[PDB]
Symmetry: C3
Subunit: 27 residues, 3 copies
């Protein structure tokens, strides 16, 4: 389906397996 909003916490998110996941976990 279409992409929904990511969390409001001020952190950056990327898209993985139909979810928003913190960018920092990949870096």
């Amino acid at each position: 389906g279409y992409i929904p909003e990511a969390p409001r916490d001020x952190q950056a998110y990327v898209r993985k397996x139909g979810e928003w996941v913190l960018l920092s976990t990949f870096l």
Copy 2:
């Protein structure tokens, strides 16, 4: 809700606080 397309400028973006921000910020 469903979010809008990111900028079309040829750069890569991540989602942060209800906006699109440049990936390069974090790399």
Copy 3:
């Protein structure tokens, strides 16, 4: 407009030029 789902292969994606691109290519 709205954005289609990223690939569902378990990899992380970022948004670039109306496409999902692998985060890994930018690291």
